[PDB]
């Protein structure tokens, strides 16, 4: 009856440092992910160089069959899943040429729909005192605000399903591929929107685990981790992906029976309005 933790893109930046403090303050093992082996066993090596004995899974969360295996590697080691941090996403670079409709379908692929594929295969083996911690980012904020004030009601309300979220994000995507997303109320960041997406799927599914796991005292909540020294953010960001995985860590990691935070967007360890 060991108690298992995992981290999706985990080999680097933020993901890396949750990584390194689950090791530290997680009791039980903790299993680092990465789509690329290689990359995975490096930073599995780099840790045990640290004095820390992480396991590793490949996974890729674009890849169906790489999320299903992984799946079935739990179910076989574990019986489930205690701890599920979803960090892995992408950004294209601020004026990268790619054209907008492409970064459009690809970021919204992995940030939002390969998250979303996650959840759906790792969401039932959560057990009893199971914590969902989903990074999102503050540009969800930014990008909310940005949308149509009929946009905003959908995105913001209490009663939107997840397949009403989904038709909403693939309009996003097909919108700016028909040179629309401007005229039918869309900001102009890709990634915000996709961001939007993981702020608001994570509040539906908590909706979901209080219908139909009452009882179960698992929490699952959004968070920012600042803006952090990262490939992704770059060299100016002002925290170390060790500050950057403190409100994760955090999220992942609330005292059993804990009643919240529960399907919030949680930064600097604080409820931010939505
Ligand atoms: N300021 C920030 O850095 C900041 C702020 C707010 C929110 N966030 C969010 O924080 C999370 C971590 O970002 P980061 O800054 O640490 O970026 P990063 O250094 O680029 O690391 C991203 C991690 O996600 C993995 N990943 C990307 N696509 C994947 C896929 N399809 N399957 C599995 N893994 C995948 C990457 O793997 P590869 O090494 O193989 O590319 C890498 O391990 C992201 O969700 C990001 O949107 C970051
Ligand atoms: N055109 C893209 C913009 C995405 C974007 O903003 N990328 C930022 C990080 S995501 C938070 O804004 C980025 O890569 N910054 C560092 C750099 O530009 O070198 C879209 O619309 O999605
Ligand atoms: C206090 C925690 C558990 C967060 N922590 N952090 C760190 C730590 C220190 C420096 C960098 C880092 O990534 C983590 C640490 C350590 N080296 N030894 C013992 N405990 C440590
Ligand atoms: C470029 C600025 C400084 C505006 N930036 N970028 C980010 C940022 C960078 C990479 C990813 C992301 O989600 C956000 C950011 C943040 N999280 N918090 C505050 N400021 C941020």
């Given at each position: 009856?060991?108690?298992?933790?995992?981290?999706?893109?985990?080999?680097?930046?933020?993901?890396?440092?949750?990584?390194?403090?689950?090791?530290?303050?997680?009791?039980?093992?903790?299993?680092?992910?990465?789509?690329?082996?290689?990359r995975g066993q490096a930073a599995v090596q780099q840790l045990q160089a640290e004095g820390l004995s992480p396991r590793?899974?490949?996974?890729?969360?674009?890849?169906?069959?790489?999320?299903?295996?992984?799946?079935?590697?739990?179910?076989?080691?574990?019986?489930?899943?205690?701890?599920?941090?979803?960090?892995?996403?992408?950004?294209?670079?601020?004026?990268?040429?790619?054209?907008?409709?492409?970064?459009?379908?690809?970021?919204?692929?992995?940030?939002?729909?390969?998250?979303?594929?996650?959840?759906?295969?790792?969401?039932?083996?959560?057990?009893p005192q199971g914590r969902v911690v989903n990074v999102s980012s503050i540009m969800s904020v930014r990008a909310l605000?940005?949308?149509?004030?009929?946009?905003?009601?959908?995105?913001?309300?209490?009663?939107?399903?997840?397949?009403?979220?989904?038709?909403?994000?693939?309009?996003?995507?097909?919108?700016?591929?028909?040179?629309?997303?401007?005229?039918?109320?869309?900001?102009?960041?890709?990634y915000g929107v996709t961001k939007i997406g993981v702020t608001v799927l994570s509040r539906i599914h908590a909706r979901?685990?209080?219908?139909?796991?009452?009882?179960?005292?698992?929490?699952?909540?959004?968070?920012?981790?600042?803006?952090?020294?990262?490939?992704?953010?770059?060299?100016?960001?002002?925290?170390?992906?060790?500050?950057?995985?403190?409100?994760?860590?955090?999220?992942?990691?609330?005292?059993?029976?804990?009643?919240?935070?529960?399907?919030?967007?949680?930064?600097?360890?604080?409820?931010?309005?939505?």
């Open positions: 009856g060991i108690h298992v933790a995992l981290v999706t893109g985990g080999n680097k930046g933020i993901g890396l440092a949750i990584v390194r403090d689950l090791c530290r303050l997680f009791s039980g093992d903790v299993v680092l992910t990465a789509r690329d082996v290689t590793f899974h490949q996974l890729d969360i674009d890849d169906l069959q790489s999320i299903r295996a992984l799946r079935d590697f739990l179910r076989k080691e574990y019986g489930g899943l205690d701890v599920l941090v979803n960090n892995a996403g992408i950004a294209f670079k601020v004026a990268d040429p790619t054209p907008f409709h492409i970064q459009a379908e690809v970021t919204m692929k992995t940030n939002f729909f390969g998250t979303r594929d996650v959840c759906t295969e790792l969401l039932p083996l959560i057990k605000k940005s949308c149509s004030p009929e946009l905003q009601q959908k995105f913001r309300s209490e009663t939107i399903t997840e397949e009403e979220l989904v038709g909403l994000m693939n309009k996003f995507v097909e919108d700016t591929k028909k040179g629309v997303h401007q005229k039918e109320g869309w900001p102009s960041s890709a979901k685990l209080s219908e139909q796991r009452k009882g179960d005292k698992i929490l699952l909540n959004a968070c920012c981790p600042g803006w952090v020294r990262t490939d992704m953010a770059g060299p100016k960001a002002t925290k170390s992906p060790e500050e950057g995985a403190e409100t994760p860590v955090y999220l992942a990691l609330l005292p059993p029976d804990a009643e919240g935070p529960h399907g919030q967007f949680v930064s600097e360890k604080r409820v931010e309005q939505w």
